[PDB]
Amino acid sequence: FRKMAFPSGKVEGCMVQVTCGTTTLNGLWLDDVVYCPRHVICTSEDMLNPNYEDLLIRKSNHNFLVQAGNVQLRVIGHSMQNCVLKLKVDTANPKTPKYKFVRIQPGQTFSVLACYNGSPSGVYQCAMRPNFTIKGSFLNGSCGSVGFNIDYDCVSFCYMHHMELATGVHAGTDLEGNFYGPFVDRQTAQAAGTDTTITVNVLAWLYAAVINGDRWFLNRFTTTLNDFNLVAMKYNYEPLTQDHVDILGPLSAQTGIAVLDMCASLKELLQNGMNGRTILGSALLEDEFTPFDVVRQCSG
Amino acid sequence: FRKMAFPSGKVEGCMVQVTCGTTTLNGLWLDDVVYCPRHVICTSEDMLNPNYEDLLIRKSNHNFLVQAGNVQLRVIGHSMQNCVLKLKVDTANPKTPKYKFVRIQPGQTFSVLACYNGSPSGVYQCAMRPNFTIKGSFLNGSCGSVGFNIDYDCVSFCYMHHMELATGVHAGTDLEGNFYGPFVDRQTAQAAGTDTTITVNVLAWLYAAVINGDRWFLNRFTTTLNDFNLVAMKYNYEPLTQDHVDILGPLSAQTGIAVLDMCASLKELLQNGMNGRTILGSALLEDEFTPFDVVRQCSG
Ligand SMILES: *[C@H](O)[C@H](CC(C)C)NC(=O)[C@H](CC(C)C)NC(=O)[C@H](CC(C)C)NC(=O)OCc1ccccc1
Ligand SMILES: *[C@H](O)[C@H](CC(C)C)NC(=O)[C@H](CC(C)C)NC(=O)[C@H](CC(C)C)NC(=O)OCc1ccccc1
Ligand SMILES: [Mg+2]
Ligand SMILES: [Mg+2]
Structure with a gap:
């Protein structure tokens, strides 16, 4: 009996790199939309107390650099949904699997494809803690890595990584941008609260x-x-x-x-x-x- | 800090199903060769004491059924190398990654893509024990699942699953068919010997x-x-x-x-x-x- 992740190949084909300014992180490329954490638009100073609406107003389509491997995607629209940025690109991802966006419940499990600069690094199996944190391994530049489950041929995306709350404890959103738990995407100290055993x-x-x-x-x-x-x-x-x-x-x-x-x-x-x-x-x-x-x- | 497997997508594209008689297991399809455990040719009675040379002589190319998803590969040659069967097929695998065959040392680690009927089930990270066993999760029909490491773009295949020696302890070969440890592919009781901590x-x-x-x-x-x-x-x-x-x-x-x-x-x-x-x-x-x-x- 081992802790087993889902085979990650279908997700590997959707990872891209998103750069805005000097900040680079991972994006999920599905159909003609790229999803990524909205804090890609922040400077280090911005992250202490961001006004995301004001910050995004200063960005146009051409300030978002999207790279799928070594080919560059043309950004033709951008939109903020909750804490996620949706970049409309001119090309549908030909490797797009059958997929759904789902919001999982505390105590359910999922696989994480940890990525850096749009490139897969590893896969591991996680549980959504009762206090809505995840105990993962996420270094700088892993934001935008996604959590998922597979049902036969359909990938159910359920998590996108946004932030490290403390050593070894992480927080993120569903693919609609809604955080799991009470967390906000701002670099201010935040309590997760008492966890419980499932x-x-x-x-x-x-x-x-x-x-x-x-x-x-x-x-x-x-x-x-x-x-x-x-x-x-x-x-x-x-x-x-x-x-x-x-x-x-x-x-x-x-x-x-x-x-x-x-x-x-x-x-x-x-x-x-x-x-x-x-x-x-x-x-x-x-x-x-x-x-x-x-x-x-x-x-x- | 999590136990992380390699992204499995490159290996997923090489898994096929191999059937000979009523026995079905997994094969690794690379270039125009399919690799699988030789005991695919055995009946349940055969496995108690097989003469593999004699048993294979009774099989021709057309007794090996190889299925890649739903397309069927034409077998044009067969060969035994140690404990592995190599089935020459008429089609090179178009998804063949850059790869090497390596024989790992005790105490090194690798990812296992557990498969059934040629279909990926899960991925997990393993160590080759000092006594040359692996502690994995392998049900009936998982034989032929492979262990691997990835170096950038090159898959180093290092293990193929052959047998369960006891509850939760497994044994297998390199991709040249040589068992790790003293084990043989026969259903007779076999000792692994004292393990040690790495x-x-x-x-x-x-x-x-x-x-x-x-x-x-x-x-x-x-x-x-x-x-x-x-x-x-x-x-x-x-x-x-x-x-x-x-x-x-x-x-x-x-x-x-x-x-x-x-x-x-x-x-x-x-x-x-x-x-x-x-x-x-x-x-x-x-x-x-x-x-x-x-x-x-x-x-x-
Ligand atoms: C994305 O790639 C990156 C991954 C982290 C592991 C670095 N995440 C961020 O850049 C993210 C942007 C902000 C606006 C959400 N910031 C953090 O994740 C940050 C990292 C720690 C090490 C500072 N975590 C955070 O701000 O949590 C709140 C906080 C604030 C102050 C002290 C402790 C915790
Ligand atoms: C392949 O898919 C399958 C996976 C096993 C988990 C079932 N392996 C075999 O069919 C393999 C073929 C023989 C010729 C190597 N047999 C075994 O793996 C067998 C399974 C146990 C549960 C019987 N293990 C075995 O024979 O080990 C030696 C042995 C013999 C008698 C008692 C204990 C151990
Ligand atoms: Mg964000
Ligand atoms: Mg064998």
């Missing part, structure tokens, strides 16, 4: 462990939804609902282990620790696998 | 932690190569050499922390445990990042 993901991962022969943690107890959620609150785990029980149905039926039974095992993991032992090669409870991720990786 | 990778990861602000583990001590390797042997860590010290040079110079100083810190991590604390969000020492992987992810 309970249903932890349970899915425990099922993954059972499916892969790892079962030391299974205990003699059961529990109730309410009894468990009292334990969940003390450990800053999200409350478990019947919706979550339902989504775990494939895993509970595959293993013959009732969800409430697994909750009892999790509760004892929480109150007693792991005692130097290991689950699926990890010494902490992993919460960045959704139930679908587990079924997917166990279905091929 | 010391130089652990040290690189500790540097990654310092680069990312995580430094609680840094201590007041230093040590010597010989003193440290006495501690390494007791904990089944590979001995550290001056070659390894040299490769850590970029990280030691970036952080201002001497390698032997970090070894002292690692030694105390080893003898005292982690005391419920965390390094880069992990509760165990991670050894599947090479020094180059760390420089790469810290260089963009």
Whole structure:
């Protein structure tokens, strides 16, 4: 059981480079539109307190330099949608996959194609934290890298990288420019607030462990939804609902282990620790696998 | 700091499906040759004790069905090289990237494009263990999935998946068909032997932690190569050499922390445990990042 990203080839064909002034970052080229973070128009001084409407008014189509590999795209229109800039270009991307723009929920996962200067660097699998941050690896110039899921042949774009809030914690928007969480694209200190552990993901991962022969943690107890959620609150785990029980149905039926039974095992993991032992090669409870991720990786 | 795979698009364009009899698996289509595990010619009974030379003699070009998406490739020659079958087809793959075949060393890393029926499923980053196994996620029909590294525009293929030795541990060949380790492509029980922790990778990861602000583990001590390797042997860590010290040079110079100083810190991590604390969000020492992987992810 590995943390698996989606194959990134369909997204690789959409990455371009966007330059305005001296600032360069990544753009997503779909049909005849290039999407990128609006702060590409900012100077370093601008970023401390930008008036984006005023700043964009001083830019014309020809101040936006868009480069797809080594061919240069002619910008014929520009528009601000929330925190994203949409650059109308004169050429439809011939590599445009079937795609949708989706806004994901906290606790769902996606792949990130980290890019620099319009060039792919690596791919990794992320979860949208309950506090709407992402724990990623993003260096300067990675802005505009996108997060996505693939359903057969259709790419569902769900995230675009905008900013680093603190060491190792990042924030961004959907592809309509709306930030996930309360963040703004301004270089002023911003609080993310208390995060929580994604309970249903932890349970899915425990099922993954059972499916892969790892079962030391299974205990003699059961529990109730309410009894468990009292334990969940003390450990800053999200409350478990019947919706979550339902989504775990494939895993509970595959293993013959009732969800409430697994909750009892999790509760004892929480109150007693792991005692130097290991689950699926990890010494902490992993919460960045959704139930679908587990079924997917166990279905091929 | 995330475990990052290479962008998989260049490899996606080379995956095909290979069927012989009822057995189907993945093939790698490069130029006018398709590479795949030779056990595609085996029945379930054959796999218990195959005579591959005898079994292949009963197959002609037309018993090999090769499918690239929905177009079918005409097989005009077949050849066994070690444990790999090479199927000469009548069409060069128009998506063939610049590529090399390389045989990696234990402790080096690579990306795996897990595939089923010739179709990409996911990508993840792996290390070749010191005992020449890989800890991956491979279901039935994943054989022929390949491991690779990318240097700018050139794909270095280094691994092809052949078999599961035990729950969660896998074995395979280079692209010349030579198994990594002592394994054979036969369904008989096979020992992998004692694994060891990749010391130089652990040290690189500790540097990654310092680069990312995580430094609680840094201590007041230093040590010597010989003193440290006495501690390494007791904990089944590979001995550290001056070659390894040299490769850590970029990280030691970036952080201002001497390698032997970090070894002292690692030694105390080893003898005292982690005391419920965390390094880069992990509760165990991670050894599947090479020094180059760390420089790469810290260089963009
Ligand atoms: C885009 O490529 C780049 C990637 C970063 C990893 C550098 N992002 C930005 O340039 C972005 C532009 C502003 C207008 C949103 N700024 C940041 O991401 C910035 C980087 C940190 C290291 C300063 N983060 C930020 O401003 O968060 C708010 C903040 C302010 C002051 C102190 C801490 C946090
Ligand atoms: C290819 O797609 C497939 C992927 C496996 C994950 C199923 N591999 C094989 O079909 C391969 C063919 C043989 C001739 C190498 N067999 C295995 O991989 C087999 C699977 C296990 C679950 C039986 N592993 C194996 O034979 O290892 C040796 C062995 C034998 C007996 C008991 C334990 C281990
Ligand atoms: Mg912005
Ligand atoms: Mg074989």
